[PDB]
Every structure is written in structure tokens, then in C-alpha cells.
Symmetry: D2
Subunit: 281 residues, 4 copies
């Protein structure tokens, strides 16, 4: 298959932008209607073919792991059925969630997974960014596509998308080439919240990466970006243009918008919710 077996997901220490909702519950457990962000993120991983998920965590984060694990008393009450099928249907049996503690920096959270991952290519996924399942085919596009491409060329993939205001993100330098959703083109560097006038593209790092086993040593020499730009010095790495829509639930308004969008699409209450929104707005 693919040498990309593991997805490393850094679990937020404290999602301060979302206080106080996340003062005592992880932001990864904040819900989009009726499921926690991390359940969408894990299913995205799985749709791409990943079966091993390495959560890079902290002490106050047990509920994320319990969400995917079995909940004895809960299930007991449940028998005491659909929901029951559902709660045990959260993590497919062929999927394994692993945990390692980080006790700062995303590049640091990645390095922490080194020992679990080995000296192999890996996927890095940020948990507060949700790629829209209805807007693209997760089994074929995006992370799924970035991995197929990595297998084909051995070139790291870095998901990106066009954004209005560039100063707010980390922009990639694709030497001015235009990219269509779905394509991969070489990147020659990354610019941390560039100043509009000097920004390399309008292409923002989305929070999805498929990286060659070489970042590992680079991470040690080294944030992800600097080992990224160092990797770039050694090999080709490409920007992959995200297909569909993403939701950034790491910012309050982004989260509120996602809440509503997923609300309108809810399998059982979406139409009624949508109707209500229309007679209400």
C-alpha cells in the first residue's frame, strides 16, 4: 500500500480563542451539532485509508480518548439501541487510537510522535480544522489525494487554500503558478502571516500535511514550518490545493458558522432546522 500509515493529531493544550467554553472541556470536543470536532477529523483520516491515529496530548484531555473507547456505564444504560449501536460505532474496530504526551509548538508535538511513528512518512492533521464531507469526497480528494500523490512521487504534500486576507495566515510560495483545486505544485518556502504587499501567494496552509520520513531528522535539528522549509532545501515538497470547503473551528465565528452549516445538513433534522432558520431570518 502506502508508507503513510499513521496520522499524528496534536491535541490543543488550551484553545484560548474559544474561552470560556473550552476552559474545562477540550476544543476538540466542542460539538458540530451532535458530534465533537475530533469525530469528524478521525473519520476524515479513516476515509483516507489511515487506521492508526496518534493523538499528541496533555493531562486534562482524557475525554477525547474516552469518546472513541468504550463507555461501560453509558452503554449499560443504553441497553437498559440505535444510539447504542452508534456509540460503539464511533471508532471502527480496525482503527487504533494511540496516545503520547507532549509536556510547546506544533513541530514539537510532531516530534513527540516520532517514537510511535518510526522513521517513516506520516500524516499531520490539525483537529480544529474540519474539511467539509459534503463538499468534497474525503475518500478520494484532499488527505486521500495527498497520500496517493505522496506514494506516487515521494514528494511531501501540504494542503492549501486561497484566502482574502493573507496577513492572517502562513502563505506558501509556489513561484506564482496558479493552482486548481485538486492539484499539487511545488512550493519553495512558506511565509508566516506575510504583509499583503510581499506575500508569495493567496494560498494559506490549511492544516493537513503528508510528510516524508525526512522531516523526522529535520524536526530534531530545528515549528513545523522551519523543518518544512529545511526539507524543501533537500527535496521537492508540494502545495496541494484543497478541494471543497474547510471550516476553521479554532476561531469563534468559524465555529459558529460550521455549527449552522452542519445543522442545515443534519441527516435527521437538517430540513426542519433549515426551514426554521428561513422563517426565523
Amino acid at each position: 500500500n502506502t508508507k503513510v500509515k499513521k496520522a499524528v493529531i496534536p491535541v490543543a493544550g488550551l484553545g484560548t480563542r474559544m474561552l470560556p467554553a473550552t476552559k474545562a472541556i477540550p476544543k476538540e470536543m466542542l460539538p458540530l451539532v451532535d458530534k465533537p470536532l475530533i469525530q469528524y477529523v478521525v473519520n476524515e483520516c479513516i476515509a483516507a485509508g489511515i487506521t492508526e491515529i496518534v493523538l499528541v496530548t496533555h493531562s486534562s484531555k482524557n475525554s477525547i480518548e474516552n469518546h472513541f473507547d468504550t463507555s461501560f456505564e453509558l452503554e449499560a444504560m443504553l441497553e437498559k439501541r440505535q444510539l447504542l449501536d452508534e456509540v460503539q460505532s464511533i471508532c471502527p474496530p480496525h482503527v487504533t487510537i494511540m496516545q503520547v504526551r507532549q509536556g510547546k509548538g506544533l513541530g514539537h508535538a510532531v516530534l513527540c510522535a516520532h517514537p510511535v511513528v518510526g522513521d517513516e512518512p506520516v500524516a499531520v492533521i490539525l483537529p480544529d480544522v474540519i474539511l467539509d464531507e459534503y463538499e468534497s469526497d474525503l475518500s478520494q480528494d484532499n488527505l486521500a489525494e495527498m497520500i496517493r500523490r505522496f506514494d506516487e512521487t515521494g514528494h511531501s504534500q501540504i494542503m492549501v487554500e486561497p484566502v482574502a486576507d493573507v496577513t492572517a495566515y502562513g502563505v506558501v510560495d509556489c513561484k506564482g503558478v496558479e493552482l486548481a483545486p485538486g492539484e499539487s505544485v511545488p512550493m519553495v518556502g512558506v511565509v508566516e502571516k506575510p504583509k499583503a504587499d510581499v506575500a508569495p501567494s493567496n494560498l494559506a496552509i490549511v492544516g493537513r500535511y503528508v510528510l516524508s520520513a525526512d522531516i523526522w531528522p529535520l524536526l530534531a535539528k530545528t515549528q513545523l514550518t522551519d523543518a518544512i522549509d529545511m526539507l524543501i532545501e533537500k527535496e521537492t515538497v508540494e502545495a496541494y490545493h484543497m478541494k471543497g470547503k474547510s471550516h476553521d473551528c479554532g476561531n469563534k465565528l468559524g465555529y459558529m458558522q460550521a455549527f449552522v452549516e452542519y445543522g442545515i445538513r443534519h441527516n435527521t433534522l437538517g430540513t426542519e432546522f433549515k426551514a426554521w432558520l428561513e422563517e426565523e431570518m
Copy 2:
């Protein structure tokens, strides 16, 4: 001020919101950026309650933690924020926790040792009384308590429904009730179009009645309620403004939007975004 303690049963596990509540308490689901329990407690405080008793479960330390101070967190934030965050539980308010050993009537019983034989407020936490459609410091719980204190008559909040077939309606021997008013209730029929909302202000007299009080072998507070009734004058208080049942998925999704539009820093942008998108 005779009523200083509010009992909040939050020890049940919340089914209708699965899978979101599998590993987190339903009481910590956010309405925008504040958990349901924060709105609830804020409501108690506004009414002058200074001691909140959570009748809980092993899995809900997140709720107490939300109200306690998060050291490492505090170690982290900033000036503006750092305030807002300690500020969750003001200094004169105490959150106490007792573990339940099922039913609301039994949940309230467990708090007896903490409350003592005193008048007590009973608050259902997955029901939100809208802070913008009422003045929570002057109305509803605030006032139902102010009236208990003035007259020692118990108060049970109710609001008019549509399908009275769908609900339990209090019997007020036919007296027309309007927002803001109270009038004796003689019981409930499952007589008026008024339903129990989930806020109760009860005389210390319910305790012994609650001890002497089931459907699934659960202790019903309705049962002690009617008992208190045959012993005394209990009044229905007509809720003012709007309530939000956040214990049902749709009701929760709808309050999320209503509150978002009213959000103090993001309400205007979200509302405009919504208006276009929708």
C-alpha cells in the same frame, strides 16, 4: 432573603444529545462559547442565590472545574481574558457537589444534608431562561424568590403551550394568568394551557414530604409537590420572556443560533453572514 441554596440535578447521563455527550456532560455543551451550566448558574446568581449544589456523577468533574480556577490556564492568559475566566464564579458564590446514589425527586433528596431544613430553589439545567427577553435579576427566579421571601408561598414556574395534549398543565382553578404573575395552583393534569418549565422555589416544608414519598422505582418530585399542596398554598408563577429547552437536539441547535445572533462581540457579523447565507 430566605432562599440561598439552589439544587441543580446534573447527575444523569444525557442520551438525546449523543454522541456529543458520550464523553462530555450535556451540561457542558456550549451555547455559542459558554456551557449551558454557566448560563444556568448565572441565572441563579442574578436571582441572589449564593450556594449552588450540584447533585452529580463520577464523570462530571468538568462541571466543577469550569467554576474553579484553572491554574495552568491562568498561568497562561490575557488581561482582558484572564479576568473573564476567574470571574466565572464570583467570590461570593459557592458551588458544592454531592454524588447521587435515580430520579429528580431523589436527586433533590440527596442535597438535603447540604441544604438542611430550609426553603430551596430547584433548577433543571437543560432549560435556559432567555436573559435578553426577561430581566433575570428582577424577573422569573429573581421574583419568584422575592415573593416566597415576602409571603412564604412556594412558586413553580409555568409557561403557556399550544398542544396541551402534549403537556402537563397546572390547575389554577381557572384563574387567567399573565406573564409576571402568581396565583395558587391546585395540582397538574397530564385546566389551563400552562406547563411547568423547570424552576421551583420550595418551602423547607418539602423535605419531610420528599423523604416520605415510584414510576420506574424513581422518587417523583411531582409527588412531594402535590403533597406540599394539600398541606399548603403553592403558586404557579407565569414565566416572563422566553425559555430554551436545550435538552433536545433541535432545541439546542436553535438556541445556538438565537444566542449567536445576540453575541456581544460577534452577533452582528454572524447575523449578517446568516442573513446572506440563509
Copy 3:
């Protein structure tokens, strides 16, 4: 007539340093004396004395203490025999455990003050959990906490348990104006100190108190040290000042499980006495 001391308050919010690393991720109060955590002995002592309301003044990382006394669902499941019933009986049905968080408040005086809202303006017992009162060496249903409560009901005077120490240079020693105390006796104390030539007595403060409702306002008005620190000894000195305080002479033996050596000595002493393994252990001990 029933006493008015209805609640015991147990400060369990601190992170116990002298016991590290053992207590690095577990409460010092959950350290076992053979096969039971220190806290169960302490709660049982409250119970033997008739207290049925216990207030733990805790911290976030200590949910295990409450879990100890609650029903342990999965465990009982996987338990369904003796263990089931032993385990099922750890906290009797008529005993209620309440918890309140100490939060930012530093100091023992603060810890006690935190329970005020649960206790009310009522007298209360204050129990430090790392000191274990030997259930074999005295009758906890009549002595010690049980007797200090009775003395407080008979005189209105707050009670402070003390015990005799050969070395006064290492303790909180009381001044009872040189009046002698025999076990079980309470006599007014006018202060608390001590070098040795100037010590007012050989009686050290053990860790148990039965205080009147008057400690409440005093505690709230106790002047802080930095960071709000309110010490209970300070509040105690003002109580002594406001009124009559007696020192009560402990019966039996105490185990200070707050220090390493003492927790070890305790573990051994309770092992030898274990209802099931006492004999075999004691013997194995004589052999070794």
C-alpha cells in the same frame, strides 16, 4: 439531645510534598495503610464519633477520594460474594460526603473557611487527614473526637486535641497555664507556642478540633499573609482571645502518615494488625 456539631470538615486540597514522588499523581490521602487509603480510616473515625456529614475541601486532581466513597459501577459489575459487599459498604448509607473546591484560597484557614457555606454558622469538627487516630488503641465512638464533641456540648468551649511529646522543639505546643492534663481531660489553653527551657507544656497539637460557630467571623477577618493566605493557627489565636478554648488530651495513639517514616511505621503497625493477614505477617516479620 443531639450535638450541634453535625459536620466534619476535611481539608484535602493540598499536593503533599513530603510524600513525593508517590503522591505526584495520586492524593496523599489515597495512600494505603495496608489495603485501605488513609482517607477511609479518617472518615470512619468521623463516623464512629456520630458525624454523618463530611465536607471535603478539595482540588481538581483529586476525584479519586470521592470515587473511593461512591458506587464504582464497572467494578461492582465485574464484581458480581464478600468483596462486592465490603466494597459496597465503604461509606454507610446514612453518611453524606460533600465536596467544595478550595480554588485560589491559600492556607488551612482558607480551606476551613471554604466550607462555611455548607456548614452554616454552626460549630464544626476540623480533621486533618494525614494524621490517623488508632482505632485499636482507643474507642473512637467514645473517645477522642467523640469525647471532644461531648465536652463542647457540655461547656460551649472549643476543643483542641493535643498529645505529649518528649521533644517540644519540633512542635506546636500549648499553654495551659501549667495545669496538668490526663488522657481524656480538657483544660483551658491560653496560647500556643518553643525552645525547651521556656516551653509552657509538653502538649503538642494533634490535628483534630471541635470549634464553635464563633470561629467563622474570625476566620473571615483573619489577616492574610501574601496571596490571601489565611492560616488557621492565626484564626485560632484570635479565637483563644475572643473566648475560652480547651486543650483535650488524646487517648490511644496517633499515626502521622504525613511524613515518610511515619507512614511506613503506620503501614507496618496496621499490617501486623490485619484481620486476615496479621498473624502471617507478624510472624514473617519476626522471622525477617
Copy 4:
């Protein structure tokens, strides 16, 4: 270098033999003087060269992980010698990973759950309620460390054993009647659970330490007609040579009350700072 890089520690089951102490704290967190049993076991894995430990766990046991992680609030609270001691707990080059076991299904099944973590590689299996005495063997040269070096040389799995008086209480190996000296590895032709003394192939009991080849993986994947480690070991013997390794020094079974109380006293006598005193104390008192 060795292909044996990972040690799997099954700590997921709930320890009934030690109730009620263990009602709400994991058995692995009980202290032998001033350290939890799991610290001793982790330190032993480290002495043997292991720098990757996989706990196969349960939800109610975060405390085991917190023990090795950074105790931010404590550290802060200490910020001297003790602060160091405290951080030093897990050496920076050693990593603890965790996986949850599904339905409580046995040690065999516990190891099996570590498969995705370890991969198709040889592993060390360590039962954490058995403590190998540090004072009585050189844990950096004998026992697990030796077992691992013999596996690297030969490629033969190593199952640790020690002589017992009563075989009916253990899983016993069959080495074809051949004597093993401490530190010696001898091929085993079978394993048997709790034999009646009259048919027992030896008086050498499985202690609880294993260094297994990557070939036990497919064997552990099989469902019996309860997945048992010894049954897997017996299937492996069928395919390949497996040796029993005779433990050096002394072991402590702290999975049973008496054994834990004895180990607590034995280690208190040896405590670095308090032993002399504690011992003296015990003499006068005994």
C-alpha cells in the same frame, strides 16, 4: 543495536486482590515506600535499554500517565532537589505511549492490542504487578537486559522463570528435564498451566517477563474454541525454538496483599535515606 525497542506493559485490568485500596486508584500506583510500583517496572525497562514503553490500558488510569508526564502545577509549586527528582521521573529519551484494550479479554489479548503500536517486530512483555528486586540483580546486565541480549544474538524468544515449591499454583515450563542456572537460557518444549505435581514438567514458574519474536503476533490473533499468552507461547514453540531464562536475584509479587506488604517492608529497610532508621525502629518494635 537491538530490534527489541518496545516493552508492552498491560495495566488495563482492575485489581480486585487489593481492594479496597485499588477501588479508585490503579493497582500499579500503589507505593513501595515512596514510589508507585509502576516506577520500578519502568525503571527496569529502562535499565535494560528499552526507551519505548507501551501501556495497554483503561480509562480510569490516567494517573499512571500523569505520573510520568510533567506535573505543571506541582513543578510550579516546587520552583529544589525535589523539583529535579520530580522532572527526572521519566528520562527525556524514554517515551510512554498508550492504547486502550477493548473488552477486558486477558493478557494475551492485552498484548495483541499493542500490535498496531509495535508493528511486526519482537517485543518485551512485562507484568507490572511483579517487581524484580534491584538490589539483588544487576538490572542493567541481567534479567530483561540479558533476555534481550540473548534474543538479539540467537533470535530465540526468552520466557522468564524461577523455581517454585508448588507448581499447582503456576504456569510451568518443560525444558526436557534440563537444569537451568540463574542467568541461563534453555530451550523449552512446552508450557503448562497449573499442573498437578505428579505430571508437572518442572518446578520452574513463569515469572512475568517475556522477550518475544515477531512471530508471536499472528499466533496471538487467533481465537480459541480466552486468548492466553502461554497458549501462544506453545504455538510458537511449534514453529521455532523458545528458551526459558532463569531469573537472577529475587522477585516480588505485589499483586497480592501479603506479597505487597512484605515487599513494602523489605524496601523500607533498604530505603536510601530512611532504611537505617526504619530498620532500627522495626527491631525495637519486633
